[PDB]
A paper describes a structure:
Galectins are a family of lectins, which is characterized by the affinity for recognizing β-galactoside-containing oligosaccharides through the evolutionarily conserved carbohydrate recognition domain (CRD). It is composed of unusual tandem repeats at the N-terminus and CRD domain at the C-terminus. The molecule used in this study is a truncated CRD domain of Gal-3, which will be called as Gal-3 CRD here after.
The crystal structures of Gal-3 CRD in the presence of TF antigen, lactose, TFN or GM1 were determined at 2.0 Å, 2.0 Å, 1.9 Å and 1.8 Å, respectively. In the structures of Gal-3 CRD complexed with TFN or GM1, the Arg186-water-Glu165-water motif-based hydrogen bond network involving in the recognition with GalNAc moiety of TF disaccharide is very conservative.
Author numbering: 116 to 250
Amino acid sequence: MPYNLPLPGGVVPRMLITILGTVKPNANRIALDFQRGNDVAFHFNPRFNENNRRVIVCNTKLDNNWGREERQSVFPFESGKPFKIQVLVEPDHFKVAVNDAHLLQYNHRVKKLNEISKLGISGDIDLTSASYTMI
Ligand SMILES: CC(=O)N[C@H]1[C@@H](Oc2ccc([N+](=O)[O-])cc2)O[C@H](CO)[C@H](O)[C@@H]1O[C@@H]1O[C@H](CO)[C@H](O)[C@H](O)[C@H]1O
Ligand SMILES: CC(=O)N[C@H]1[C@@H](Oc2ccc([N+](=O)[O-])cc2)O[C@H](CO)[C@H](O)[C@@H]1O[C@@H]1O[C@H](CO)[C@H](O)[C@H](O)[C@H]1O
């Protein structure tokens, strides 16, 4: 099962979200879901073993349909190891860093950031903490 991080004032530039945890043994997937109503503004989905390969899929869900995926092979997650995911919100994109190192960028497709009221956290991880602050 997952956990939901409420974002009362919605997503706003300068917001920094930090997810601390440990990847479960023989992990299959991890998923962060920034939601706007029934839409998923930003889906960050590390897939550990998809067709015998590790890949990170990012996408947006609108009107119950997923859009064009953005993929990358660099994969900084390992089963059973501690991890830290840091997401910085900029006016133009979500900046994702893993273990204090830039990982990727995802340009905003859903533009009304103020409406993105929560962040779903799911997958094969044990959560230590999931919080946010403004920097
Ligand atoms: C392993 C494989 O041949 N994957 C194909 C396949 O993927 C699926 C997945 C689910 C279902 N289904 O629930 O019915 C059918 C097929 O078909 C896809 C297109 O329909 C892709 O061709 C997929 O290959 C993967 O495509 C992605 C990009 O979409 C990427 O290129 C992957 O590297 C590639 O394996
Ligand atoms: C089951 C699976 O492999 N889902 C993939 C797949 O989806 C399909 C759906 C239908 C067919 N088909 O009828 O031949 C092929 C493949 O490929 C999609 C991309 O082309 C997605 O990768 C889909 O997985 C879904 O991806 C979205 C993000 O794009 C999100 O991660 C969903 O949770 C995930 O199921």
